From a paper:
The use of SeU as a provider of anomalous signal for the SAD phasing has been examined on crystals of several proteins and a nucleic acid.
The high concentrations of urea are routinely used for denaturation of proteins, but no adverse effects were observed after relatively short exposure of protein crystals to SeU.
Residue numbers in the entry: 59 to 87, 99 to 326
The structure:
Amino acid sequence: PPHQLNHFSDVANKAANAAGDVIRKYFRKSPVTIADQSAEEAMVSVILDNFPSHAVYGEEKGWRCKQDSADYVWVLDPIDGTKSFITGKPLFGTLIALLQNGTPILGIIDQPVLKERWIGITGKRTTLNGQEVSTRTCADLSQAYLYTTSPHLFSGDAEEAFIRVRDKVKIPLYGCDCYAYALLSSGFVDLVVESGLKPYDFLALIPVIEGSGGVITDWKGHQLRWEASPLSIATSFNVVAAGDKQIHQQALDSLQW
């Protein structure tokens, strides 16, 4: 297992703290691009000051590393949910993931306006603001509360797949971004289904959801993996996350991907 997780947490939390400071000045005062750049720059200042050998892939400026390669890769998105940010809606989030040879070992979802921070760590239960959180059981897809960001954020076949699961759930809801994954981790949402998600908007979710007892994969039900390198391309993935493995299963059958 990894031995440096507490030290990784402290820098993780400082990165997140520094992103928050930038984000709160620009939220509700184009501010979004200044915010997104400054915030990313703030996080890499912290991460690279504490670990010079480490690499980062940020949503604004891609890969950045001194060395040829690194065993440790920081995948960042300061504002996951730019449309929410632009419209004054405080459900966007800063996402921080640390990858050890391509496996995520830490993830943060921070909401700096709501002052809510979910940390996921390998081999620990996921916490929200220092308190342990847990997904909830849910019998059947008909009992499930579902979130997706948008309906026409699906093209052609993805929209058919999505419709199939949509018709079976208790109620489909829209318009959290990453917050919906935070909510599911805390046991308030049963299922999140999305298409066209870039790595810096899902890698942080994995330890958060998994350490809460939930499951998150692609539409085929495979492990969400993205090996970040200097020669890495941020390509779209499809994501299904559930509080309950039975629900995940059942969702996978409706997706027919």
